[PDB]
Design a protein around this ligand. Structure first.
Ligand code: SF4
Length: 71
């Protein structure tokens, strides 16, 4: 399965991730991206139909702020 998070420390608020994949990411309020549904650790499990989309924005994020991994 796939899980993803956003590092707010490095996000440049380019709006790419939560414009492309609103199912996974959202504008936290001030332009910084955040997963729509994080756990205590901050990770969000990605629905299988959204895996390829999540992997794409992970590579496309200009600031390397999106962290994604297989679990
Ligand atoms: S794509 Fe990266 S830099 Fe752009 S809003 Fe999302 S996390 Fe921030």
């Amino acid at each position: 399965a796939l899980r993803t998070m956003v590092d707010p420390d490095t996000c440049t608020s380019c709006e790419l991730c939560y414009d492309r994949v609103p199912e996974v990411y959202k504008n936290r309020g001030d332009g910084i991206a955040e997963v729509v549904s994080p756990g205590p650790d901050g990770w969000m499990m990605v629905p299988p139909e959204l895996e390829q989309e999540v992997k794409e924005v992970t590579d496309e994020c200009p600031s390397g702020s999106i962290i994604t991994e297989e679990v």
